[PDB]
From TrEMBL, chain A:
It comes from the Eukaryota. This is Uncharacterized protein.
From TrEMBL, chain B:
It comes from the Eukaryota. This is Uncharacterized protein. Keywords: Membrane, Transmembrane, Transmembrane helix. It comes from Trypanosoma brucei brucei (strain 927/4 GUTat10.1). The keyword Transmembrane applies. GO terms for cellular component: kinetoplast; mitochondrion.
């Protein structure tokens, strides 16, 4: 009757097959599992690549699935995601910086980027206020090529955050990545500008913590789970089932993911 | 028969000269309005850069 929407973005067929087997075996057939390329609710996205229709890329450190190495850490990494066009078309994150060099007008693109950054900054400040932190850390790649997208990102994120009353500390990519992997307890909320390096950093943090599920906030309004490995996808499916209103099944999936990461389907 | 013909004959040369000058003026104005428009086209290097960015390099 119900429906879970599976989005595939750069994920090997093995991961998708494992996710389908897990949902079929755990749910028992009560909720169907359809595949698509875009969704707004009740959606699990598999693979490193960013799907179409997501504007924020928040990720946290769930208490239950904390690795013993990272026990007690609490830092929220929110990646700002600009609207995604078709693979052939030029993405906004690159158009906004190349058209300016070429002299082409960049008004509509700037407007769209401003809207996306405002939404991401609102999400980040909400998370920071909920956690109680006073300052957030902006992450911008300091390459000369990205001298316009990051400039707008800072100009808008700092504006919105200061309007909300919190402080912002800008930093590069290498230093923040090393600090997040080595000493993450010194960062409460870290926003990431939209670049490939920031996506890799978010994935690295989501994996090093022990494997977690990344939450995507879409344009339509809602939360869709995201995973890239067996354990991450299992946790994402568990969270999705919990959202649908299944507690025991979600707990079983979470326990199976904790015990046997790569073979959860057989474990449970 | 006599007077108006003679005065028309007197008029002919100056009118011929002035009309020749007017025609030359028209030709000169035609020539003066000619400008080569050089057009400018999007440099291909920006296309090569957008191509590279799309590759995720």
């Amino acid at each position: 009757s119900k429906q879970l929407t599976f989005i595939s973005a750069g994920a090997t067929a093995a991961v998708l097959q494992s996710a389908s087997a897990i949902v079929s075996k755990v749910a028992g057939g009560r909720v169907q599992t359809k595949t698509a390329k875009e969704a707004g609710r009740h959606a699990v996205v598999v693979g490193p690549e960013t799907p179409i229709g997501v504007h924020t890329a928040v990720t946290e450190v769930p208490k239950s699935a904390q690795d013993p190495l990272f026990s007690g850490v609490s830092t929220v990494v929110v990646r700002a995601v600009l609207p995604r066009a078709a693979p052939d078309s030029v993405q906004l994150r690159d158009a906004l910086d190349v058209y300016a060099s070429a002299g082409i007008d960049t008004k509509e693109e700037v407007r769209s980027a401003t809207e996306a950054f405002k939404k991401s900054a609102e999400v980040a400040v909400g998370k920071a206020k909920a956690k109680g932190v006073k300052r957030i850390v902006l992450v911008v790649k300091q390459a000369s090529k990205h001298n316009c997208i990051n400039e707008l990102f800072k100009k808008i994120s700092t504006e919105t955050i200061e309007s909300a009353g919190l402080t912002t500390e800008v930093v590069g990519t290498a230093a923040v990545a090393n600090q997040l992997i080595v000493n993450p307890e010194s960062l409460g909320v870290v926003l990431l500008n939209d670049v490939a390096a920031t996506e890799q950093i978010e994935l690295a943090f989501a994996g090093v913590v022990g494997g977690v599920s990344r939450v995507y906030h879409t344009v339509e309004g809602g939360k869709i789970s995201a995973g890239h490995s067996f354990k991450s996808v299992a946790l994402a499916v568990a969270q999705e089932l919990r959202e649908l209103g299944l507690s025991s099944e979600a707990d079983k999936v979470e326990a199976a993911a904790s015990k046997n990461p790569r073979a959860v389907v057989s474990a449970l | 028969d006599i007077m108006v013909p003679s005065f028309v004959y007197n008029k002919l040369p100056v009118i011929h000269f002035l009309q020749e000058k007017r025609a030359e003026q028209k030709l000169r104005r035609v020539l003066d309005e000619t400008y080569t428009e050089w057009t400018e086209e999007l440099d291909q290097a920006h296309v090569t850069d957008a191509i590279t960015r799309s590759l995720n390099i």
